Symmetry: C3
Subunit: 449 residues, 3 copies
């Protein structure tokens, strides 16, 4: 609906609210096929320029078939990997089934009359299937009567051009698989055109709002999808496309922005600093909160966010209390500490946080008026209403011009509650209570002494 | 001019000097256009092979137009992002203006007679514009007289081939935008050929030395540029190219190399280590120093460095004192500590730093003579004069064969000034004074006790 | 042979054994050539459609030549770089030799009669050379008799099509070099087709098992290779391909998986945690152990691993004792500590580690039976026998279905040996003995007190 934002002066952080998230929980697996011609070289003494062109294109066809066959003798073990495991295990499992005898023929028979099909494999999985290119028919009908005789017939020039056009897609598909070891992401238009992807979506056994969501964000769907080279067997080239399944829809999401909060004493080396940890995207999910620490996990389109759950953490919903009261006793809010008071800015959804320290020149400007605000040392914020850019030292930042409402939540910088002499100043992954217990230990060594 | 280098034995670091930096401060925004034909299908009963080829290519043209139109219904909200904000906000702001009524026609009128133009938008921005492909004229003149009648005329075979060539660039442009959600970087030769880029540079209202700088480093310019898909309206396909504006030129730059400095006691677990932080590129800029911590921010061509200011920090010029005296009282030099005395090497501009610990075999070699130096435990350095490679354990490193002069600055390893029993040995982001104050606190707990 | 795996309950880690490693120690350098035609424009008044097509393709040829020439005036100084130095120094050194007078002609003469050659340069390096495209002969024989007269001859339509096909590869090669500043990796099929790569391998002066290894893993060879644009001189386009040389073969390798080990007290903020550091691939190498911390350094195909030594560390073989006894006195096993008891899983080679803390729902499932195991708080493990997935909170993980045998090594979680009140709970890069000495210091402040 409406994007809103809150800046917390006390902790030098901001939350952008109002987003609606779709979270990828599963995969749709589809088998894409190219029908091939099983032909060997039938060289006949031909020297005319058009037979030579047809022969040269037929060699590129053949080398594409054999290159794919060589690629397959080394199964997709270099596909993907992580502690998160295989993103392609769903597709890989369909490939395994496809190497079973009679399975390829089962797709042959469904595609004997139509372009799209549904096939129930012998493992219980009912996959959609699609033939996107028919080379077997083209080659068997227009080119074998040319080359498979004693002396070659002469094709017309339009057959030469037409065959280069049709074969082109096989060769590009083969080029993409060859440099990516048989797994590509995003899925190119060569693997699946927009028209084929949209038809695939439209033909799936899913609700209408799931069809409409994926159809209106096809480029995000492409970027979250995989194409896995499966098998070349019995005149069939088959590869599996994994499209994202969003098992969480329209869930409330927010983004946390953080920036270093330091004291502003004039003598360098006398200053302590703190920064809230775990910036990034948060989404309500199934009674908990899903947190996405890696910036690439979530794609944003205006009001809507699309996130992959594979590299997310599941947190209690009380994690949000760190944005109402960082000292709350229900969740141990996390911070890191340092004495590195370097100046910086963070562009948020509706404004900009500025951490200005030392001698840095920090300002906010408008295109037509120039400088309209000069920041003082400390952590501060400006909204995108009437501000176009922010400058911190020698770096210029553009503020997002998205519509929405910002709220400045005044409050004492919490760094001012700490005594600089007993402050644990080099904590890389700490927490409010962890810092307070280290301070309790440092007052105790002086209490008895 | 002359690249020179200094190795500081006392802190296991080196500085390479003599570079001349250009720092990207802004953007040139240019509107690139393709003139389209607004035609719907005019199917006529044609079965001849040449009409079929023309129809098939015209469908690929149409699907490219509609794919771009679908891509645009989801505005560039997944373009780029960071705490640094939008790198494309300048281009995005031009796109917004372009969606305003009459603006497209204003580019139409400037390009009514010539290929390049200058257009002042209704927001005060005077952009250069360029038409790189004219499909409207080609289609309206050579192909509508073919297909837009009752029965189709037959084109000659050269028209089939010529149209495939002209349409190819539209389709590739469309392919690139489709997998990148409407924003690409580097800018491909499909978006802008070298000839069009060089002409664009040459035609800009900028000084001659700025023209010559960008023209002599076009591949660096390409890699620092963006192409943003704007609009398809009124037979015009328009996208905006952002080229880097170097607002700092020929500024002195240097690169800091660092390596772990450890004691060399024979019993493992008894050794302490220190490493200088903030390796990377430094450039004088506007009375301060711009520091680039991320390795990809700066491209180097021989003597010259090209850096983006977006992910840089602005430091006081006294930061350089950490290379003359790391204990100086004007700047709090930063270090990290540990007990991980693993061996490694760092290839610098003119040589190699070697940190050799434990039982590691560390040597430097020449191609023709083999091993010419054997390192002992500690941190040491060799220049590229007469050395081709360095080996540390099982890893071989090639030294850069660039011309220049190295200087070995002798000095006591500062790790030897510290008492291993009160040394803070696991500081991730500390500083000379921060370590000294932690040591003062650790001598105080024993002073009274 | 057989992949096996051991899970160490005491330290929440697992080792996957049985892999056979090939480690890249060096480079094969090969010179790839394209023979060019040194022709300037010989415009003659021609307006026929076929001369126009030939002229237009000849301009694309010419602009490709000049674009490559402009790219070369800026030598490969933006190729690659790191503290590890140039991965391409071997190739770059061949380019330098190639700019020497008479060297190009020396490759001309070897390729005067055959397609492949061996040439000894004046620096003692005997490189294999290959001509992959002959444009000089095609242009001088089929196209100069067309355009280089007073009025242009008319080519047949097959010459137009044939020349577009032959020139295409020059233009794509030029496109790839243009956006990558003259250095590409992986090496595309445009740079080197599978047939040319396999022939290059087969023709090298290396043993038969090295030929067979690289020929059976060509896509891994491609991904570990470089293509470096060298020179355009005297009708020769030359670029150098660097293929990996595996100087270590069939060496035993293993992979270390780690996960956080925390106490499981019910009150949040009262829990301490530890995690073993230095997860990743380890390989026996030359009496030491090569360790690869970066996930992309090693490619895995079933039973076999292929690693680059450039970003590896060399460790004593006693590093493996951290997998038999983490308290052993021969090697100081490394750990990091924290109070962040967030739940997670790690998919291993043959199973899954699960660290379940707080209120997280953690389970393992089978496709046909659903949930078959529910984890309790702590660190635990399940093998891939009869398990398909694992769920931790809202994230689902797929287990690898590779064949092999897992072993569960029971043992007391070592985190239970530590007193939570004197535990150093925020150590980013520590070690068993380092933690024990910090605890000794914390018992001493209370011993006297
Ligand atoms: C430190 O001691 C005070 C005094 O009892 C107590 O209120 C506070 O909660 C303690 N903090 C920690 C982290 O133990
Ligand atoms: C530690 O104490 C000595 C003695 O007064 C002083 O010279 C030094 O500057 C102190 N260091 C810090 C970091 O406070
Ligand atoms: C701590 O002290 C005990 C008692 O002497 C000793 O056994 C142990 O090795 C010490 N640990 C360290 C790391 O010094």
């Amino acid at each position: 609906q409406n994007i809103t934002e809150e800046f917390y002066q006390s902790t030098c952080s901001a939350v952008s609210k109002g987003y609606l998230g779709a979270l990828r929980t599963g995969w749709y697996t589809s088998v894409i096929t190219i029908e091939l011609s099983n032909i060997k070289e039938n060289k006949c003494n031909g020297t005319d320029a058009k037979v030579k062109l047809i022969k040269q294109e037929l060699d590129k066809y053949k080398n594409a078939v054999t290159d794919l066959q060589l690629l397959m003798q080394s199964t997709p073990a270099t596909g993907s990997g992580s502690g998160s495991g295989s993103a392609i295990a769903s597709g890989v499992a369909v490939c395994k089934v496809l190497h079973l005898e009679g399975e390829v023929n089962k797709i042959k028979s469904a595609l004997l009359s139509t372009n799209k099909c549904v096939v129930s494999l012998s493992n219980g999985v009912s996959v959609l299937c699609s033939k996107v290119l028919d080379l077997k028919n083209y080659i068997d009908k227009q080119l074998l009567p040319i080359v498979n005789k004693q002396s070659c017939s002469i094709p017309n020039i339009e057959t030469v051009i037409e065959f280069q056009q049709k074969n082109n897609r096989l060769l590009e598909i083969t080029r993409e698989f060859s440099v990516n070891a048989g797994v590509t992401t995003p899925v190119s238009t060569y693997m699946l055109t927009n028209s084929e992807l949209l038809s695939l979506i439209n033909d799936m056994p899913i609700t209408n709002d799931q069809k409409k969501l994926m159809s209106n964000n096809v480029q995000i769907v492409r970027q979250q999808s995989y194409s896995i080279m499966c098998i070349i067997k019995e005149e069939v080239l088959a590869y599996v496309v994994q499209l994202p399944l969003y098992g969480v829809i329209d869930t409330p999401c927010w983004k946390l922005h953080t920036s270093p909060l330091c004291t502003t004493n004039t003598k360098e080396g006398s200053n302590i600093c703190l920064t809230r940890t775990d910036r990034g995207w948060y989404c309500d999910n199934a009674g908990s909160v899903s947190f996405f620490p890696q910036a690439e996990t979530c794609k944003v389109q205006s009001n809507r966010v699309f996130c992959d759950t594979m590299n997310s953490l599941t947190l209690p919903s009380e994690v949000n209390l760190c944005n109402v009261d960082i000292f709350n006793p229900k969740y141990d809010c996390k911070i890191m500490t340092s004495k590195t008071d370097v100046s910086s800015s963070v562009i948020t959804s509706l404004g900009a946080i500025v951490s200005c320290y030392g001698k840095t020149k920090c300002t906010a400007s408008n295109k037509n008026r120039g400088i309209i605000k000069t920041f003082s040392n400390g952590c501060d914020y400006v909204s995108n209403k009437g501000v176009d850019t922010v400058s911190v030292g020698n770096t210029l930042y553009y503020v997002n011009k998205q519509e929405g409402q910002s709220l400045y939540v005044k409050g004492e910088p919490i760094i001012n509650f700490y005594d600089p002499l007993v402050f644990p100043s080099d904590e890389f992954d700490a927490s409010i209570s962890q810092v307070n217990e280290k301070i309790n230990q440092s007052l105790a060594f002086i209490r008895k002494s």
